[PDB]
Amino acid sequence: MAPLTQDRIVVTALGILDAEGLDALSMRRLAQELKTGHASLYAHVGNRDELLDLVFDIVLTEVEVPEPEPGRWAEQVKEMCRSLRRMFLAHRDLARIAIDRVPLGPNGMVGMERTMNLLRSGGLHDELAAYGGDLLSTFVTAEALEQSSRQGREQAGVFADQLHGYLKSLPATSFPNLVHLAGPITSLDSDRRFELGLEIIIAGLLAGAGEAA
């Protein structure tokens, strides 16, 4: 062991995790890479759970919640989200982690704070700015999973196409809509589906917002 810290340990874990995925991450695996005994490891970071939280928190430094600006709101919200997504893309299995874990931690609440600022900044009231953030982050995760599981795109490529084949060759009299919509369902264009989900939620917010009429 060289000078071990709760940061060199984490930067190490993540290293393995990109490389090889969630299940290859174990305590014994980790302590191996770093050239140390279980003592030093369990000291800074604990069992496997705690470790994933620390892993989660550190990569978060990557996202950016911009400071509120004169009439850029909608875009400033898209920026923010599109930023968070770019994060999930680089790092294997990170979304899997996110589903059953608290959005807590240094980065975790320096992040909520700036998320709440910007939203409330849209002339949005309490309950709606609170929940709103939940829904966005919820929205962007799900998406990131969806993409997570898409050679590369050859297995998905043909599956999608064989799905697209069955749909159109379905009978028209009993299935007018699905015959009509075989593309827009099987479309494996995540980029544009993503900008859509955003357009929608956001307008749902703005509309939600100034309801006081």
Question: Which residues are near ligand ZCT by CB under 6 A?
Answer: 60-61, 63-65, 80, 84, 98-99, 101, 103, 107-108, 110-112, 114-115, 133-134, 137-138, 141-142, 145-146, 149
Instruction: Kindly state the tokens that stand for 46.
Output: 């604990």
Comparison of 9 and 136: residue with beta carbon closer to its own copies: 136
**Residue 139 CB neighbour total at 10 angstroms:** 16
Give dist(CA 172, CA 166) in Å, integer: 12
Using CB under 8 A as the binding rule, whether residue 196 contacts its own copies is answered as: yes
At residue 115, the 3 state secondary structure works out as helix
Give dist(CA 175, CA 169) in Å, integer: 10
Comparison of 4 and 60: residue with beta carbon closer to ligand ZCT: 60
Instruction: Kindly state the tokens that stand for 40.
Output: 């030093």
Radius of gyration of the chain (CA): 21
Comparison of 40 and 137: residue with beta carbon closer to ligand ZCT: 137
DSSP state of 47: S
Site string for its own copies, 88-127 (x = CB under 8 A): -----------xx---x----x--xx--xx--x-----xx
Which one among 18, 33, 49, 134 touches its own copies, defined by CB under 8 A?
Answer: 134
Give dist(CA 24, CA 93) in Å, integer: 11
Give dist(CA 134, CA 144) in Å, integer: 15
154 binds, among ligand ZCT, its own copies, none (CB under 5 to 8 A by kind): none
Comparison of 33 and 199: residue with beta carbon closer to its own copies: 199
Give dist(CA 198, CA 7) in Å, integer: 35
Footprint of its own copies (CB under 8 A): 99-100, 104, 109, 112-113, 116-117, 120, 126-132, 134-135, 138-139, 142, 145, 149, 163, 170, 175, 177-178, 180-181, 184-185, 187-188, 193, 196-197, 199-208
